[PDB]
Design an enzyme around this catalytic site. Structure first.
Site, PDB file in Angstrom:
ATOM      1  N   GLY C  38      11.048  13.777   0.105  1.00  0.00           N
ATOM      2  CA  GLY C  38      12.332  13.096   0.091  1.00  0.00           C
ATOM      3  C   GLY C  38      13.391  13.718  -0.801  1.00  0.00           C
ATOM      4  O   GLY C  38      14.355  13.061  -1.172  1.00  0.00           O
ATOM      5  N   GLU C  64      18.362  26.674   2.906  1.00  0.00           N
ATOM      6  CA  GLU C  64      17.491  26.871   4.045  1.00  0.00           C
ATOM      7  C   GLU C  64      17.936  26.109   5.286  1.00  0.00           C
ATOM      8  O   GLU C  64      18.122  26.717   6.346  1.00  0.00           O
ATOM      9  CB  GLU C  64      16.053  26.516   3.669  1.00  0.00           C
ATOM     10  CG  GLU C  64      15.038  27.534   4.182  1.00  0.00           C
ATOM     11  CD  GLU C  64      13.773  27.602   3.331  1.00  0.00           C
ATOM     12  OE1 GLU C  64      13.142  26.544   3.112  1.00  0.00           O
ATOM     13  OE2 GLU C  64      13.406  28.714   2.886  1.00  0.00           O
ATOM     14  N   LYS C 211      12.090  12.937 -17.676  1.00  0.00           N
ATOM     15  CA  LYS C 211      12.956  12.996 -18.833  1.00  0.00           C
ATOM     16  C   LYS C 211      14.435  12.878 -18.501  1.00  0.00           C
ATOM     17  O   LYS C 211      14.850  13.098 -17.364  1.00  0.00           O
ATOM     18  CB  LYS C 211      12.722  14.282 -19.644  1.00  0.00           C
ATOM     19  CG  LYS C 211      13.430  15.488 -19.117  1.00  0.00           C
ATOM     20  CD  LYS C 211      13.384  16.662 -20.082  1.00  0.00           C
ATOM     21  CE  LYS C 211      13.917  17.920 -19.392  1.00  0.00           C
ATOM     22  NZ  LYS C 211      13.940  19.137 -20.239  1.00  0.00           N
ATOM     23  N   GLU C 305      -4.768 -11.854   9.302  1.00  0.00           N
ATOM     24  CA  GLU C 305      -6.132 -12.005   9.814  1.00  0.00           C
ATOM     25  C   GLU C 305      -6.210 -12.447  11.278  1.00  0.00           C
ATOM     26  O   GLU C 305      -7.104 -12.024  12.012  1.00  0.00           O
ATOM     27  CB  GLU C 305      -6.903 -13.008   8.964  1.00  0.00           C
ATOM     28  CG  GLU C 305      -6.875 -12.723   7.487  1.00  0.00           C
ATOM     29  CD  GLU C 305      -7.654 -13.751   6.698  1.00  0.00           C
ATOM     30  OE1 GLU C 305      -7.429 -14.957   6.918  1.00  0.00           O
ATOM     31  OE2 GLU C 305      -8.487 -13.356   5.853  1.00  0.00           O
ATOM     32  N   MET C 445      -2.493 -27.594 -11.932  1.00  0.00           N
ATOM     33  CA  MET C 445      -1.071 -27.731 -11.643  1.00  0.00           C
ATOM     34  C   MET C 445      -0.366 -27.669 -12.978  1.00  0.00           C
ATOM     35  O   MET C 445      -0.592 -28.503 -13.851  1.00  0.00           O
ATOM     36  CB  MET C 445      -0.749 -29.059 -10.963  1.00  0.00           C
ATOM     37  CG  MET C 445      -0.676 -28.947  -9.461  1.00  0.00           C
ATOM     38  SD  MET C 445       0.557 -30.043  -8.797  1.00  0.00           S
ATOM     39  CE  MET C 445       1.843 -28.893  -8.356  1.00  0.00           C
TER      40      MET C 445
HETATM   41  N1  LIG Z   1     -10.207 -28.934  16.430  1.00  0.00           N
HETATM   42  C1  LIG Z   1     -10.979 -28.758  15.370  1.00  0.00           C
HETATM   43  N2  LIG Z   1     -11.815 -29.835  15.075  1.00  0.00           N
HETATM   44  C2  LIG Z   1     -12.688 -29.805  13.998  1.00  0.00           C
HETATM   45  N3  LIG Z   1     -12.776 -28.677  13.207  1.00  0.00           N
HETATM   46  C3  LIG Z   1     -11.942 -27.610  13.471  1.00  0.00           C
HETATM   47  C4  LIG Z   1     -11.056 -27.589  14.577  1.00  0.00           C
HETATM   48  N4  LIG Z   1     -10.444 -26.374  14.511  1.00  0.00           N
HETATM   49  C5  LIG Z   1     -10.913 -25.636  13.496  1.00  0.00           C
HETATM   50  N5  LIG Z   1     -11.875 -26.392  12.849  1.00  0.00           N
HETATM   51  C6  LIG Z   1     -12.718 -26.018  11.625  1.00  0.00           C
HETATM   52  O1  LIG Z   1     -11.959 -25.266  10.656  1.00  0.00           O
HETATM   53  C7  LIG Z   1     -12.600 -24.009  10.359  1.00  0.00           C
HETATM   54  C8  LIG Z   1     -11.647 -22.784  10.331  1.00  0.00           C
HETATM   55  O2  LIG Z   1     -10.731 -23.015   9.263  1.00  0.00           O
HETATM   56  P1  LIG Z   1      -9.370 -22.197   8.980  1.00  0.00           P
HETATM   57  O3  LIG Z   1      -8.723 -21.667  10.253  1.00  0.00           O
HETATM   58  O4  LIG Z   1      -8.563 -23.226   8.328  1.00  0.00           O
HETATM   59  O5  LIG Z   1      -9.381 -21.106   7.826  1.00  0.00           O
HETATM   60  P2  LIG Z   1     -10.304 -20.504   6.721  1.00  0.00           P
HETATM   61  O6  LIG Z   1     -11.670 -21.057   6.744  1.00  0.00           O
HETATM   62  O7  LIG Z   1      -9.568 -20.792   5.485  1.00  0.00           O
HETATM   63  O8  LIG Z   1     -10.198 -18.978   6.851  1.00  0.00           O
HETATM   64  P3  LIG Z   1     -10.836 -18.114   8.001  1.00  0.00           P
HETATM   65  O9  LIG Z   1      -9.712 -17.377   8.750  1.00  0.00           O
HETATM   66  O10 LIG Z   1     -11.845 -17.213   7.344  1.00  0.00           O
HETATM   67  O11 LIG Z   1     -11.571 -19.075   8.955  1.00  0.00           O
HETATM   68  C9  LIG Z   1     -13.784 -23.877  11.309  1.00  0.00           C
HETATM   69  O12 LIG Z   1     -14.910 -23.387  10.575  1.00  0.00           O
HETATM   70  C10 LIG Z   1     -13.994 -25.278  11.874  1.00  0.00           C
HETATM   71  O13 LIG Z   1     -15.043 -26.006  11.354  1.00  0.00           O
HETATM   72  N1  LIG Z   2      14.739   6.903   9.352  1.00  0.00           N
HETATM   73  C1  LIG Z   2      13.688   7.309   8.679  1.00  0.00           C
HETATM   74  N2  LIG Z   2      12.782   6.302   8.382  1.00  0.00           N
HETATM   75  C2  LIG Z   2      11.627   6.564   7.677  1.00  0.00           C
HETATM   76  N3  LIG Z   2      11.340   7.852   7.256  1.00  0.00           N
HETATM   77  C3  LIG Z   2      12.228   8.858   7.538  1.00  0.00           C
HETATM   78  C4  LIG Z   2      13.417   8.636   8.261  1.00  0.00           C
HETATM   79  N4  LIG Z   2      14.014   9.855   8.338  1.00  0.00           N
HETATM   80  C5  LIG Z   2      13.293  10.784   7.743  1.00  0.00           C
HETATM   81  N5  LIG Z   2      12.171  10.176   7.244  1.00  0.00           N
HETATM   82  C6  LIG Z   2      11.084  10.868   6.504  1.00  0.00           C
HETATM   83  O1  LIG Z   2      11.734  11.440   5.375  1.00  0.00           O
HETATM   84  C7  LIG Z   2      11.236  12.735   5.116  1.00  0.00           C
HETATM   85  C8  LIG Z   2      12.348  13.752   5.003  1.00  0.00           C
HETATM   86  O2  LIG Z   2      12.223  14.500   3.790  1.00  0.00           O
HETATM   87  P1  LIG Z   2      13.502  15.309   3.328  1.00  0.00           P
HETATM   88  O3  LIG Z   2      14.100  16.065   4.497  1.00  0.00           O
HETATM   89  O4  LIG Z   2      14.414  14.314   2.756  1.00  0.00           O
HETATM   90  O5  LIG Z   2      13.148  16.316   2.134  1.00  0.00           O
HETATM   91  P2  LIG Z   2      11.804  16.963   1.618  1.00  0.00           P
HETATM   92  O6  LIG Z   2      10.650  16.552   2.472  1.00  0.00           O
HETATM   93  O7  LIG Z   2      11.730  16.512   0.236  1.00  0.00           O
HETATM   94  O8  LIG Z   2      11.990  18.503   1.532  1.00  0.00           O
HETATM   95  P3  LIG Z   2      12.069  19.519   2.758  1.00  0.00           P
HETATM   96  O9  LIG Z   2      13.514  20.094   2.876  1.00  0.00           O
HETATM   97  O10 LIG Z   2      11.001  20.545   2.542  1.00  0.00           O
HETATM   98  O11 LIG Z   2      11.687  18.731   4.011  1.00  0.00           O
HETATM   99  C9  LIG Z   2      10.235  13.090   6.200  1.00  0.00           C
HETATM  100  O12 LIG Z   2       8.953  13.267   5.579  1.00  0.00           O
HETATM  101  C10 LIG Z   2      10.282  11.937   7.197  1.00  0.00           C
HETATM  102  O13 LIG Z   2       9.065  11.423   7.627  1.00  0.00           O
HETATM  103 MG   LIG Z   3      -7.622 -17.221   8.398  1.00  0.00          MG
END
Ligand SMILES: Nc1ncnc2c1ncn2[C@@H]1O[C@H](COP(=O)(O)OP(=O)(O)OP(=O)(O)O)[C@@H](O)[C@H]1O
Ligand SMILES: Nc1ncnc2c1ncn2[C@@H]1O[C@H](COP(=O)(O)OP(=O)(O)OP(=O)(O)O)[C@@H](O)[C@H]1O
Ligand SMILES: [Mg+2]
Ligand SMILES: Nc1ncnc2c1ncn2[C@@H]1O[C@H](COP(=O)(O)OP(=O)(O)OP(=O)(O)O)[C@@H](O)[C@H]1O
Ligand SMILES: Nc1ncnc2c1ncn2[C@@H]1O[C@H](COP(=O)(O)OP(=O)(O)OP(=O)(O)O)[C@@H](O)[C@H]1O
Ligand SMILES: Nc1ncnc2c1ncn2[C@@H]1O[C@H](COP(=O)(O)OP(=O)(O)OP(=O)(O)O)[C@@H](O)[C@H]1O
Ligand SMILES: Nc1ncnc2c1ncn2[C@@H]1O[C@H](COP(=O)(O)OP(=O)(O)OP(=O)(O)O)[C@@H](O)[C@H]1O
Ligand SMILES: [Mg+2]
Ligand SMILES: [Mg+2]
EC number: 2.7.11.1
Lengths: 484, 484, 484
Positions: C38, C64, C211, C305, C445
């Site tokens: 960059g 260049e 620096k 997730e 809390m």
């Molecule tokens: N309609 C429903 N009736 C009864 N229980 C339910 C129902 N839907 C989901 N569940 C329950 O809730 C659980 C899933 O929970 P949840 O989506 O809140 O997230 P979590 O446990 O915090 O995270 P993760 O993404 O790892 O599951 C299940 O294990 C199940 O027992």
């Molecule tokens: N719109 C954009 N969004 C996200 N990244 C970008 C965008 N445009 C350029 N880049 C990224 O920015 C970088 C450009 O580097 P830049 O031309 O600024 O100088 P440099 O890499 O330090 O030196 P050199 O002249 O050797 O390339 C690239 O690595 C590229 O992936």
């Molecule tokens: Mg979850």
């Protein structure tokens, strides 16, 4: 030729599996490695096999070793090159320098040689060529750029000539540049690296096919050994999961056990006996080995913890006579310290021993002993090796594992192998009334029903006696029960 | 123009996603990597696709490989370049030296090369150009400074001509300088690095777009495979969280289970069966597979622990005939050791298998087997891979996991995946009266109600029988309850 | 402002905070980094902002890249340099070589260039100057000593002229020497280092001011992103602990909970919901979101997730319709895999999403998911970022955390964040009579009283029903209590 790349078999055990056929024909293959990695061996075994398996003559160009030595050394593998030289099947093109000479002879011979070789190729109708240590040639006073041209010329000419070549190169670092001038790599059509990795005072040879222009091959390193029969490679990752499975049963050597396993062990299966020291795994092994002899069947006992003599003493004290077992040539005991070799070597010794004795049963006393020092991954690789070989070979296998902690062990195996075994027999100490009693348990059986009870058992001169479970106890598995 | 910078698609699977559209038109892109990384392949695949997908003629300049070879090798991928050369869609410009080389060629060739390249570009109205190993050219006797000018010149002229070019460079260290002279990086407008990282005897191919002056692109490394269809890249970090979800249910193969899950698994869901070895995950998998064929639906069973034969023996012993499943072409069993390949490869093989068989259900017996050796992050990346692919494909998938410790397991997954899965089924041993019994529990279900009971279950010839919970016990999760 | 040195603002977001005001005026600032870090972007943005914000004419010296390319590339960020060149606000000084050239020029040119630049500066009444890649100039054939003189000369003259300059330099190693010749570092008044660190297949860009002769500045590395708006820096260590706090309350979406929290969550507070998978954190989030809409307030749900579809299916199954929430333009769902980008990016995306939607409530489902792979220190830095932004923005935030082990968890968070959060809600499994029941608990809390009971709760189609505590139980936290 408007088809895929065609390969030529090297017949070097394992190589053609990794290279998916062998070296690509008419092309040069670079084979580099550090000092003593087996470069020469590869190139020679490449020519030899060619002559002996397909009657394809071969030209061997040496820049440092003398033809006399190259023949002398080959005898190490029961190779009579001298004979093949006479039969005109093999021609050793001596390109080595002499005790005296001059200088400023750069690409001079690089061109003269490209002819001297073309000569012998035509003269003996050569199909395979191997140049040993091309590196040493321009090791006269050259730079990376000069080396790239000379190689490119050589390879190119040999390609025109249509010869399938193997070129030897030296390296200085096991994982650094592929070859001395870091230029050969890109000049060759094919790259093979032989490594002799140290690590923990032990050496481990591995071969890798880095690239093969135009075709596929197996990636990464592969362990191999150098024996009296040359380079032996084990494509542990090439072994297919197509093992034969039957419902036939066999005895454990312990009737009560056989019942718990719902009729005994399966012929096609791998059994694991786990437990702290003293639990009696070594006993079950003895009894399993004796049962194969009682049925006049050959069995091998690879012991890695007890001496040949001690195994006898302890076996005799449990009844069963191992003396007779050996005379009748039904039982074969091995014995060796895990430290006496690397897993690769052991794996091989296990294999060969199995081939020279046609075992029906096999028992490895303490896999856990072979796990000493070695990395978990290098070990699992060894287990899969021995495990699989036995499986595809219809050989019933019993393996022993001593857990690091008596009582309380929360996992069957510390190395995590229980997922690779078919039947799991677990021995455990149980503290009952200030005494250390035992217990046997068929933890699992993939095909059978097996007993789920944790049966206490004692050991006597007669052997193992399996009694009843501790129905009136709690937290048994923990080792320190609590009667209800 | 008065807008950003237009890109040209390479049609190389995955690459155009990583590069946010493809290569910047009218500019050259530097592609470097160590030996055998796939530089050439990329450069050819870039031309070929240009021809076959947009009928954009291409010029291929080669400095080392022969034109015959280039065409020879391309066959490896069912690539017929010789035909394209005839049709005048592809022109291979041979710039390689002759077996009889000559000195000082670092200026005549530069302008002469461009003359020819320009000539060819004009002659065939070439739109794409790719120079293979420009490195080799000044690998005659030059210094970084001399290298920087020549490259600058080459790039500049090609720019003027308006050619969208692909330049190939070689490296020597997987993570050391980007290119040989440590100058090429700064002279190019675009840089792509192909890496073939070792690490534990295995090789992993990755691709990274280091920079593209003028536009955006995905950053970091991305694993890719070289197959019979060339380079295949998986932008695992590009897969969108836009998977389709429905309330449709499907059976498990076990009726009682289906009840506990509030009416069966969801069609759009990922189920995970965890437990110690022997608990019976492999059984639930079979019963899951069979239920898909009983409803005349295709299912794939990727087995990484048991052989094809064994799966059949054990399956038959649980009733259900896997034999028929295969004949009726409703069930396909794969089987292969996790060590036979790297995760990237496996991921692909699973995908292709899914495409050539249009499965409705998929089951991977033991992800825990595929986690052997591999790093946790590499593993999670694999899981997210197969998981999301299944989700977006309307394929119900059942995955197996063997916890490292029987009884006492405090975490569902050692690898920590349970947060990526929809429904979790937990199997666990329960010590009861000196005996090893099983228990099944629907740990969680995201859209359904599911039973909260920890039901004990037995295993017979018929299969799995889910009975009642241990209402009269305490500390059951632990494996060693306390009757009360 | 108590700083001895007058600075000039770059207007580059975050840089002026890091540099304590901007670049010292009348001095040169070395900006070095590896390829693609960059450098050019920085120098160009420096001139651009100078023209647009202060009407300060700028001179850009390129060695260049071509003047057309520099203009073409700037369109990536929506800047029209071409327009500025016409209006005479920006002058690009072409110092690049031509694709015909010779040899020898990096010296008098150093004097020719000096006289050239002084012309442009005087002609355009320039105040800002940036020389892109001075490195490449003596990249003709020079030694460390020759470089130091030339730079010092250039710098010195620029100083006399009174110009505030930005000089770009290239490095080869991410942590090795500051610049190529290891001489630039000491010749410049200020040194800025742009890094693009790999580490685990991901790329992390950081900016550091090594620096600034004469003044203070922020020490160390700071993460930044390149977007359609150029360089964006986050001085995560510059965030002051002066967040506004109020006693205003807000509902959680669950009435019973609100009671437990002594009247609902505080508007100005960060809430943490932790528990094993399945406990229901995702549920509480939904209810937290829905409640902001029910009161006609905007809220964002960042999900890492579950897919956008799944979140909807499950939400509906819990009643609450997410469909309508979106239409009414009160609820915005994001969704993305944590692997799809590094923390820095994520953090920025969350911020922007917040600005383009003026949320009143925010819910990040699973921080523990964004903790995958990343180092704990990099993670905490991310948490402090999102957390702090939310606080100073009067935005109430509910964050989720899944604990690696169900039941038995000894710490609230494995990442150790609970010390950063204001209110903590703990969900957990309780083994009761062979069954898995849930328990909800307001662990802490800061401003309220909150209930101390560990109430069990059930989940239904209606949602979460908070019941009573297990008064007659011991070892509840353990997961498997004892009935007393
Ligand atoms: N309609 C429903 N009736 C009864 N229980 C339910 C129902 N839907 C989901 N569940 C329950 O809730 C659980 C899933 O929970 P949840 O989506 O809140 O997230 P979590 O446990 O915090 O995270 P993760 O993404 O790892 O599951 C299940 O294990 C199940 O027992
Ligand atoms: N719109 C954009 N969004 C996200 N990244 C970008 C965008 N445009 C350029 N880049 C990224 O920015 C970088 C450009 O580097 P830049 O031309 O600024 O100088 P440099 O890499 O330090 O030196 P050199 O002249 O050797 O390339 C690239 O690595 C590229 O992936
Ligand atoms: Mg979850
Ligand atoms: N019969 C044998 N059994 C086991 N190992 C052997 C036997 N004969 C030779 N070896 C081993 O094989 C190696 C021989 O290496 P070889 O001469 O094939 O080529 P190299 O080591 O690759 O290259 P160089 O020409 O520098 O030696 C020795 O290191 C030696 O220990
Ligand atoms: N004659 C005997 N009578 C009764 N018990 C015996 C006799 N010989 C050995 N034992 C018992 O058997 C145990 C040794 O068992 P064994 O040789 O089977 O192998 P192990 O426990 O599996 O492995 P390890 O080599 O670690 O001991 C002793 O602890 C002892 O209690
Ligand atoms: N059909 C195929 N299937 C799988 N892999 C293949 C196939 N064909 C070639 N390969 C592999 O692809 C690689 C070929 O690399 P390629 O010739 O494209 O360029 P490179 O290795 O980057 O540079 P160089 O010109 O030095 O070889 C080989 O390492 C080989 O193993
Ligand atoms: N015919 C049978 N009758 C009764 N039980 C059986 C029978 N066959 C297998 N089993 C039981 O099932 C268990 C093996 O289960 P399974 O093949 O389902 O997979 P797993 O436990 O998930 O994984 P692993 O491959 O580690 O065993 C054994 O422990 C055994 O008790
Ligand atoms: Mg023993
Ligand atoms: Mg199984």
């Amino acid at each position: 030729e408007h088809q895929a790349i065609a390969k030529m078999r090297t017949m070097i055990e394992g190589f053609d599996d990794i290279s998916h056929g062998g070296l690509p024909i008419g092309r040069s293959t670079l084979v580099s490695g550090t000092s003593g990695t087996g470069k020469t061996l590869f190139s020679i075994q490449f020519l030899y096999n060619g002559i002996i398996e397909f009657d394809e003559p071969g030209v061997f160009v040496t820049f440092e070793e003398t033809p006399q030595d190259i023949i002398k050394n080959a005898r190490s593998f029961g190779w009579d090159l001298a004979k093949l030289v006479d039969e005109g099947k093999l021609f050793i093109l001596d390109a080595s320098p002499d005790p005296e000479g001059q200088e400023v002879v750069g690409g001079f011979d690089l061109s003269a040689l490209i002819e001297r070789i073309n000569y012998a190729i035509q003269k003996y109708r050569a199909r395979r060529v191997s140049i040993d240590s091309v590196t040493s040639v321009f090791q006269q006073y050259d730079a990376s750029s000069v080396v790239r041209r000379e190689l490119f010329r050589l390879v190119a000419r040999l390609k025109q000539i249509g010869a399938t070549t193997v070129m030897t190169t030296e390296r200085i670092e096991e994982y650094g540049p592929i070859a001395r001038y870091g230029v050969e790599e890109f000049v060759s059509d094919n790259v093979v690296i032989l490594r002799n990795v140290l690590e923990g005072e032990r050496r481990r040879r591995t071969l890798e096919i880095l690239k093969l222009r135009g075709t596929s091959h197996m990636k990464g390193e592969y362990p191999f050994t150098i024996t009296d029969h040359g380079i032996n490679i084990f494509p542990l990752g090439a072994m297919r999961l197509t093992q034969r499975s039957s419902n036939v049963r066999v005895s454990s050597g312990v009737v009560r056990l056989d019942e718990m396993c719902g009729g005994g062990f399966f012929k096609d299966s791998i059994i694991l006996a786990t437990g702290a020291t003293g639990t009696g795994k070594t006993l079950l092994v003895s009894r399993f080995v004796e049962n194969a002899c009682a049925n006049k069947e050959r069995a091998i006992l690879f012991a890695y913890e007890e001496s040949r003599a001690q195994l006898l003493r302890n076996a005799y004290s449990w009844g069963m006579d191992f003396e007779e077992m050996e005379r009748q040539n039904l039982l074969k005991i091995v014995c060796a310290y895990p430290e006496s070799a690397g897993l690769e070597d052991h794996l091989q010794i296990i294999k060969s021993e199995i081939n020279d004795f046609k075992p029906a049963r096999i028992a490895i006393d303490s896999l856990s002993a072979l796990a000493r020092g070695v990395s978990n991954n290098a070990f699992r690789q060894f287990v899969i090796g021995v495990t699989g070989y036995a499986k595809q070979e219809e050989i019933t296998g019993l393996f022993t594992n001593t857990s690091d902690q008596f009582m309380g062990a929360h996992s069957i195996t510390d190395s995590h192998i229980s997922t690779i075994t078919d039947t799991i027999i677990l021995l455990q100490y149980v503290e009952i009334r200030g005494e250390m009693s035992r217990a046997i348990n068929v933890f699992k059986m993939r095909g059978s029903w097996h007993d789920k009870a944790i049966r206490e058992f004692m050991i006597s001169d007669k052997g193992p006696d399996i009694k009843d479970s501790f129905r009136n106890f709690e937290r048994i598995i923990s080792g320190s029960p609590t009667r209800i």
